[PDB]
Design a binder for this molecule. Structure first.
Ligand code: CL
Ligand code: CL
Ligand code: CL
Ligand code: NA
Length: 216
């Protein structure tokens, strides 16, 4: 409880979403660079994380890093690039955690821009050295499963440094590993289910954009 660092994973490909755009006869745009709220998806995500009151925000870049970094160029973030770039989400998070000063890390997906600052703040507040907190698929409370969950989450930096090097690369298998090991996982109910939407398909982006257009 001395310092909270955010790590935003903004380094991955999003081939499915780009193909979706091509299949609509649109020019594909990488998910993080799609327009949202007068800015880009990635700027929206970072703004939410900073608005959650973290002491610093690390952003991990890789895929199309030049463009993602240019999108963020006005923002108060510390950028670290994956090199080599072809690493999975867990490795991107690890690179970010390596760059973070804090004892608690708030891990967020760059492509999940509808999480509110208030939800992120609640997630960060429930983490400690031995407790992982996470955006829940349903109601708040202790979790005995990791169905339908992944990001954002918060955890002790030492705990993340022990778990992130393990597994296949995806976050969800690590959460199941943690539960098997007896790690306490606390689910925080989303303000709105839109907060759970990561941009995998173009339809996910349109769903988020529609929410943003409604709420200004
Ligand atoms: Cl918008
Ligand atoms: Cl770097
Ligand atoms: Cl701690
Ligand atoms: Na499509």
């Amino acid at each position: 409880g001395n310092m909270i660092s955010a790590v935003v994973a903004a380094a991955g490909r999003g081939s499915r979403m780009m193909r979706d755009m091509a299949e609509l006869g649109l020019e594909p745009v990488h998910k993080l660079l799609l327009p949202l709220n007068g800015v880009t998806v990635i700027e929206a995500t970072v703004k939410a994380v900073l608005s959650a009151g973290v002491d610093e925000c690390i952003v991990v870049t890789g895929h199309r890093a030049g463009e993602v970094e240019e999108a963020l160029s006005g923002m108060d973030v510390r950028v670290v690039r994956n090199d080599p770039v072809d690493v999975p989400l867990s490795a991107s998070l690890l690179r970010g955690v390596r760059a973070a000063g804090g004892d608690i890390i708030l891990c967020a997906a760059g492509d999940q821009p509808a999480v509110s600052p208030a939800t992120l703040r609640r997630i960060a507040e429930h983490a400690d050295g031995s407790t992982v907190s996470i955006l829940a698929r349903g109601e708040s409370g202790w979790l005995d499963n990791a169905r339908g969950i992944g990001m954002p989450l918060a955890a002790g930096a030492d705990l993340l440094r022990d778990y992130l090097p393990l597994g296949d690369g995806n976050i969800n298998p690590l959460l199941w590993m943690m539960l098997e090991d007896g790690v306490r996982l606390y689910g925080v109910e989303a303000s709105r289910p839109i907060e759970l939407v990561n941009i995998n398909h173009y339809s996910d982006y349109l769903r988020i954009r529609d929410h943003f257009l409604r709420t200004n």
